[PDB]
Amino acid sequence: ADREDDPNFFKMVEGFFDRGASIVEDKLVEDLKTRETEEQKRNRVRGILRIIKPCNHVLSLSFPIRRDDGSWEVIEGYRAQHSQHRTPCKGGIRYSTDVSVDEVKALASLMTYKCAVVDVPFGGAKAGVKINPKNYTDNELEKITRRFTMELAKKGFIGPGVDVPAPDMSTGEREMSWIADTYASTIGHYDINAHACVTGKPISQGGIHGRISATGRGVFHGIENFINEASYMSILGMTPGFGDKTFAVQGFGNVGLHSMRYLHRFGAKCVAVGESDGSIWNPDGIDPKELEDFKLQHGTILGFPKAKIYEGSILEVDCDILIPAASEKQLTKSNAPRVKAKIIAEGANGPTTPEADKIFLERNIMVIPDLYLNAGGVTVSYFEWLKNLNHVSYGRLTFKYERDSNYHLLMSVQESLERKFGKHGGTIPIVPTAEFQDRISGASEKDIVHSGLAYTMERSARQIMRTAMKYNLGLDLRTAAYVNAIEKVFRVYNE
Amino acid sequence: ADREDDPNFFKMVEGFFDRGASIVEDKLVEDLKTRETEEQKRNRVRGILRIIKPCNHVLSLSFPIRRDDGSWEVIEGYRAQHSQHRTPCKGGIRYSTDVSVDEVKALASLMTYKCAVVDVPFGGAKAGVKINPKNYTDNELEKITRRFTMELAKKGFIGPGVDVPAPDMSTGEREMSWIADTYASTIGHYDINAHACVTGKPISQGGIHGRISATGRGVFHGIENFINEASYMSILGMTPGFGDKTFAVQGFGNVGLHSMRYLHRFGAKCVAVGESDGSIWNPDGIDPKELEDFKLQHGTILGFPKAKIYEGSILEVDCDILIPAASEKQLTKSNAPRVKAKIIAEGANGPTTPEADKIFLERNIMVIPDLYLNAGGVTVSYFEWLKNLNHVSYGRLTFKYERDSNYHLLMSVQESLERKFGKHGGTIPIVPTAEFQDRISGASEKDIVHSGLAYTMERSARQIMRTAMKYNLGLDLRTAAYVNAIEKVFRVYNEAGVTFT
Amino acid sequence: ADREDDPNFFKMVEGFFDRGASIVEDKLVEDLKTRETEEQKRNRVRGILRIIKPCNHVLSLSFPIRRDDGSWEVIEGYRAQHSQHRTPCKGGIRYSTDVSVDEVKALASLMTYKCAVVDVPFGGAKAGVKINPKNYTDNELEKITRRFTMELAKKGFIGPGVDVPAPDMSTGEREMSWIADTYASTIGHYDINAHACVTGKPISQGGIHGRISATGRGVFHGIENFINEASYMSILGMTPGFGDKTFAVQGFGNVGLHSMRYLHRFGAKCVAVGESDGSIWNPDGIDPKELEDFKLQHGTILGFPKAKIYEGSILEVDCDILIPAASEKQLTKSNAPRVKAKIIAEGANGPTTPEADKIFLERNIMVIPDLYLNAGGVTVSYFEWLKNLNHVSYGRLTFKYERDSNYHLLMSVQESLERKFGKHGGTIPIVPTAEFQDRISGASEKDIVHSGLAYTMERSARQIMRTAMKYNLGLDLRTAAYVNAIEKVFRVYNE
Amino acid sequence: ADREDDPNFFKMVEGFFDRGASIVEDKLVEDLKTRETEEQKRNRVRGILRIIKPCNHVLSLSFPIRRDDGSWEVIEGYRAQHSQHRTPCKGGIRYSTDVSVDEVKALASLMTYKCAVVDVPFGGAKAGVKINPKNYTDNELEKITRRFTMELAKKGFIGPGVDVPAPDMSTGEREMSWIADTYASTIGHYDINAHACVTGKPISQGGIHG
Ligand SMILES: NC(=O)C1=CN([C@@H]2O[C@H](COP(=O)(O)OP(=O)(O)OC[C@H]3O[C@@H](n4cnc5c(N)ncnc54)[C@H](OP(=O)(O)O)[C@@H]3O)[C@@H](O)[C@H]2O)C=CC1
Ligand SMILES: NC(=O)C1=CN([C@@H]2O[C@H](COP(=O)(O)OP(=O)(O)OC[C@H]3O[C@@H](n4cnc5c(N)ncnc54)[C@H](OP(=O)(O)O)[C@@H]3O)[C@@H](O)[C@H]2O)C=CC1
Ligand SMILES: NC(=O)C1=CN([C@@H]2O[C@H](COP(=O)(O)OP(=O)(O)OC[C@H]3O[C@@H](n4cnc5c(N)ncnc54)[C@H](OP(=O)(O)O)[C@@H]3O)[C@@H](O)[C@H]2O)C=CC1
Ligand SMILES: Nc1nc2c(ncn2[C@@H]2O[C@H](COP(=O)(O)OP(=O)(O)OP(=O)(O)O)[C@@H](O)[C@H]2O)c(=O)[nH]1
Ligand SMILES: Nc1nc2c(ncn2[C@@H]2O[C@H](COP(=O)(O)OP(=O)(O)OP(=O)(O)O)[C@@H](O)[C@H]2O)c(=O)[nH]1
Ligand SMILES: Nc1nc2c(ncn2[C@@H]2O[C@H](COP(=O)(O)OP(=O)(O)OP(=O)(O)O)[C@@H](O)[C@H]2O)c(=O)[nH]1
Ligand SMILES: Nc1nc2c(ncn2[C@@H]2O[C@H](COP(=O)(O)OP(=O)(O)OP(=O)(O)O)[C@@H](O)[C@H]2O)c(=O)[nH]1
Ligand SMILES: N[C@@H](CCC(=O)O)C(=O)O
């Protein structure tokens, strides 16, 4: 929302891009070894940079639905694909009334830069259907999801090797299940990869472990990597580690709740949670599980016992870490001054506007940009896609073999230690650590999701941090990120 | 593009539809014998129409091209598909800087209804690439139109059973030629109907006789059928025939030049011709050839020796028939009062605003509506598609059979007569008249394109007259054309038993 | 053919399935989250089950063959596909005159539950062709299976992502190689996975190590996993292990032979072999490699030097383990009373009728059921399909790197120890044991085939045992299997 | 490219092949356990080697290129597919005026055998374009390698599951980046593995280290 700082979402992310585009400009220029030198290069660079920014394809739908009561209602929807520099395109399907071609455009672009930060080989994309799901029956919501999949399918805006959609606001397993089902029942009847057409699926339908809670978990890993970095924690004026920290969470959805779950888990105190009808609060702590229970029970977080109803912008709560996990453009120049938190964890997609970004920097609020924080989603969606493509549960073929080998490896250290210390040593049992015993059959699917996500969110955190320090962006983490997203994408477009 | 009457093209055309949807609502309801009677009758009518109105699909593209000097430039373009109630979608590609999503949506809807009026079984579509072709080389234009065909091809917005493009403003044969080749050379390299993927092609690449000229030829018939409906020539205050009549045309590309040739030929005097940089005028007349000649050499019509450069909007020139045949929204509430013409033939696509539309109605100016008049284009496009689907030129297999059969038919008349009138009659030579001698091998391609277009514009015109009189619309020819369009498209959504569930 | 207990195969298998369902009906109901509680919980469950029982599709075929002699012959055939809850369907091709639509239907249903038991991601399907393969030429058997492949191709009853057939009775490597070719020749000419359209292929033609041997090798594992659980050999009244044990095998084909090989390899004495023209028998042992050479050289077992022509049902031979490894409905209400063996290992497909299952139950005779026991097949079939998908022989790219990794790994233990124990140790070599020497390069293909199979069979063995006890089924191992197969297929059915 | 020791390239490899095939012919017959043994095995070995030697498919192309001066030039080109005993076929693209159907047939036969030596699961294939790339501009070269690819794809002579090329003399990363792009862009937009339609590509376009 916010009426004086409601930039057009696409141009806004275009802004973030352009910014980062400038600081690399000299770097990218000097990289490229084009013989025709001088400034034919500098044009070449903003020439390529001028193709990256715009979306390649955007598909607008109007299709009819027969409502439950029997009337005919026409549904509109869009899907934008921002890049093909990596095939296929990846991106969520969101069901809200805010959906416009433009927010679907900005979201898609965001997805391209996102996957670049996080070394996921997808071009960005995104869909939206202009319905408030709440206002439709489950049966209607089904018809809408299916017909919208048929439209995307025929015009080639879904398909495992074209465009793998995924969840977003007001969509989850359920919908992806229908998407995956009408795709694979019509267009995909022959595709050996028909169920790699969408991600976020029920595990029972092709899904992967922890894909619901994966963007939350990646939020945590993203926060952790910085909060445990003394360089930024000096500058910020706070203690390393999660132990003393308090945080608030805007939105209690897929990334809202699970961000709370993992942050609460490793020691952070969740004092407040908000939703579209109000917030709640308690600086002695809200427990995610109790709150989740109460919310599933009473469809609302409000009136939760162990926390008062908080009157006012939950974004402005006193806390260490502010985590927007709702829609975009919520921390703006209007309310950026009075935010109170020292770390903004952009769990949501593009939730703080550039005007706010400016205040936050000279206020020395640290913004972990959505670019890097909520990529835990595609990264596991990339894992889910890879699972579908490989047609095996990770570990299935190697569990026993790895179990046995580690055992004989361990045995070799033993039989060799006894071969030397004849009997002064005696019999020297070499046994797996309790933790190496969990790790003894090799990585299961779960293990890959957990560890692969952790590696990802740190390897990327490091090269963001390194790029902040190489260009002296200090706490403008977003600008280092785009600098890395650009650098990686630009490398494709010229080489 | 006006300003203080610059309505949204797509919504504008919705209004033209909505107006006719209301004249028919009672009839559609009456006809529909859904047992579920009463008003859930009406609502299902109201509900169907709400499904006819929006475009089904709209594709927006950004793609780069390597411009000739090595620079990269990002080209944008769109194509909208209004309806599938008939397949494929049919509609043109337009290269202007006016090209927006909302334009391309309006044009599309306009093409759906246009086909319903003239019984051409196509849903409506239309594309635009947002460039000024006058600013790029032939090389860059080729690059740009093929990539567009590529980008359309991949997402299902070009294809013979899917969506057959065509020429519009600043595109023609040359572009269609590239569009057919790039399509047929990639996505279509095994399609037996690869080249039915677009109309407006050169004759030599699958094109049909007089496709270029046919939109204007259609304008001609469409004016003829009304200007000789004594009924309407009465109310208008004119005389039947083209005989004394006088006309001006906005535009001198595909639709202007040929409407001008064809009216000139059947006696009407052309007194003015406009293009973007200005107009030229002469009440004694301008010759369509000399003007075309002058234009092909000089790049403009301004300076044509046998005419004065008019100062002021060609739409206001004193004539009988003004022919908007340029871009849309040229006749608005600003300039509608000042039109001097008594018949406006809407050769262009959406040239009249609805506010201007009321003014002409109130001013007793009969606007032949786009819906009907400029349908010459599709109808022959539709023939070009039939031509590609059948992989024979018309007649090719029956010419010698028809000739022989006719000769033998006539001989039967003769021999039978001679048998009766033994010798008081003698030999009674039954010979083809001169004109039947031309028609004696049956129809050539050109014959079909000519006679079939004629049939379509006559049949649809009387349908439009019959309907305007039944509903006492008088000179509201546009809504009568929309009341027909709706009746037909509605018939399709209705009889379908359902549509989906 | 038993003239007084020949249930229609499909209904018979529906009985097994019905049986298991009413056991978990209460279970499926309680788990089912459904807001709409009550018995419209029960009825959705039973409706879903009512969907699972019937085959989704059946293709009946008539196609002419011109015989070697130049005459015309109308060959009938069938493929039934029972479930698509996993794509592709999997299942063998059978050449017999027993092949009827109802038999094919039952076998296909048996495939979907079979893969459910062993966690092989395939819906089930099965095809037969109503021929006596003994009555046709190699050339005629090629025209037939090639044209059958074409009939199956053109109607979507074969394809690497739609339905992957494999061997069964009177088909094998040589027929699979034709199917694979005929498919990949035509339809699949562009398919990167044309060769994964069928399993059982020769190894040079995309096949996998030990897939001929795979099924009985799993018969061995499946017996083994049960013959070593004291809980079950107690109840039985037998000693654990293969040590003292004795078995007879109906069928000496691809299941019978290798079942007999591997059991023999690990102790047990094979005392009877039988086929369709008789049985042999020798209580002191029938060596499998001998019987093979003799079989191969004589096209029969009867009159094998080292055994006597047994007269009387091989199903009633005195032994510990009876292994039906031929056709279905061999063990029926008439002769189940007279079976004498304590463990019936169903390597065949549906060898035991339900009335005979009942008799076996109350006679305290443990029938290890087809559903689980002969799923060694699909499992190794699964492995090859993946092999074909992954376009690499297992280990090819990692052998050298793993070798050096382990040597440096050990070398790390060596030098770490020598750094501590300066010269009080002196030189402390750390070397692979012989067993870790063999694994020191990582798993070969056969490594995976062998350990993957074994893993699959022990794990599936357990979850059957686990189910039996929780449901107090005792020896009704079959109902335990169906209960897992029903459990697993259900739960895919979520919208 | 010599004088009086310049054998037909294809036959020169057939020569090598034929030699190493008598060395094993005895072994192959002894191997094959066919029940109709005899010389009816010696010859069914003779038949099988007779099918291996000749390329299964050769495609000769003439296609036009608009040169940079505007003129039209008919550019000559070939890809031979030696064997499908493993799909897809594998083998490079050579830009040279020595390119002939026999040279390219030979390089093709050399490539299946090269992949057998190192157990690379591809039947051999090779391609040549009869041009001398020092005489052409990069833009021309691009115009060529792309149009060559479009012709290859429509006739089934490139494709990740059917035939995958690679670099060779006067080709490399750049032309690999072109082929990949024109195939993926046209014939295989829906093909998940489109960019596996050729090897040697730039690291950034799907290529590999080293
Ligand atoms: N995999 C993913 O889901 C990923 C999501 N994101 C971004 O995360 C954000 C949320 O995704 P998700 O959590 O899945 O959406 P959900 O539908 O899962 O839940 C979203 C929550 O946000 C609340 N909300 C939305 N707008 C506001 C607002 N203006 N003020 C207060 N509360 C609000 C909703 O409340 P109510 O229910 O009352 O409307 C709901 O509780 C989106 O912006 C998405 O783009 C980023 C990366 C990955
Ligand atoms: N098949 C067809 O071609 C059909 C076309 N139509 C409609 O007819 C109209 C034109 O079609 P077409 O003739 O093909 O397009 P063209 O590309 O042939 O150019 C038409 C003419 O319009 C002139 N023009 C453009 N804008 C203006 C303006 N603002 N004021 C005055 N003159 C102007 C151009 O002059 P300059 O070159 O100086 O811009 C040109 O001479 C469009 O609306 C089209 O949709 C209708 C039916 C079928
Ligand atoms: N991968 C596989 O092959 C799998 C097979 N199965 C099941 O195992 C059984 C057979 O498999 P397979 O070994 O492949 O079949 P085969 O074609 O290999 O022949 C099986 C054996 O059964 C014998 N036989 C057939 N009918 C009778 C009969 N009425 N009485 C006695 N002996 C008979 C045959 O002898 P004769 O030559 O005299 O008929 C032959 O020795 C079937 O139920 C099959 O579905 C289970 C899992 C997988
Ligand atoms: N809503 C909700 N989700 C949960 C809860 N516990 C676990 N999950 C998520 O649901 C999935 C199943 O949980 P587990 O099987 O225990 O897996 P896990 O990786 O050990 O769970 P976590 O480490 O907490 O993410 C995981 O992705 C969890 O993140 C819970 O109490 N409520
Ligand atoms: N632009 C332009 N087109 C012309 C001219 N003369 C004829 N044509 C068109 O080119 C095509 C070939 O002309 P003709 O072979 O005479 O065909 P036609 O049907 O007899 O031509 P018309 O009856 O004059 O339309 C027809 O579509 C004509 O409309 C001209 O002078 N200028
Ligand atoms: N039919 C048949 N198969 C055999 C015979 N000997 C080995 N095999 C199978 O043929 C395949 C190739 O054998 P090997 O290369 O020796 O591999 P293996 O994994 O050691 O096979 P196993 O002896 O079962 O452990 C394996 O599946 C063997 O089971 C035999 O004598 N007859
Ligand atoms: N032509 C050329 N290639 C080089 C040079 N240095 C490295 N490369 C190649 O660049 C690729 C990446 O090289 P490096 O990043 O140095 O890593 P590498 O795997 O050690 O490569 P090698 O030095 O060949 O062992 C490898 O293919 C190298 O062979 C060089 O100086 N000239
Ligand atoms: N839409 C999610 C990612 C969804 C996905 O591709 O899995 C995001 O904005 O990051």
Ligand SMILES: N[C@@H](CCC(=O)O)C(=O)O
């Ligand atoms: N632009 C033309 C195209 C007709 C066609 O050829 O489809 C029209 O609006 O009628």
Ligand SMILES: N[C@@H](CCC(=O)O)C(=O)O
């Ligand atoms: N007929 C085999 C099929 C095994 C396979 O799919 O390879 C079975 O019953 O399991």
Ligand SMILES: N[C@@H](CCC(=O)O)C(=O)O
């Ligand atoms: N053309 C090279 C390599 C071919 C390839 O990489 O496929 C050769 O002669 O082996």
Ligand SMILES: [Zn+2]
């Ligand atoms: Zn549609």
Ligand SMILES: [Zn+2]
């Ligand atoms: Zn997890």
Ligand SMILES: [Zn+2]
């Ligand atoms: Zn594109």
Ligand SMILES: [Zn+2]
């Ligand atoms: Zn004509």
Ligand SMILES: [Zn+2]
């Ligand atoms: Zn047939």
Ligand SMILES: [Zn+2]
């Ligand atoms: Zn083995």
Ligand SMILES: [Zn+2]
């Ligand atoms: Zn060609």
Ligand SMILES: [Zn+2]
């Ligand atoms: Zn290297």
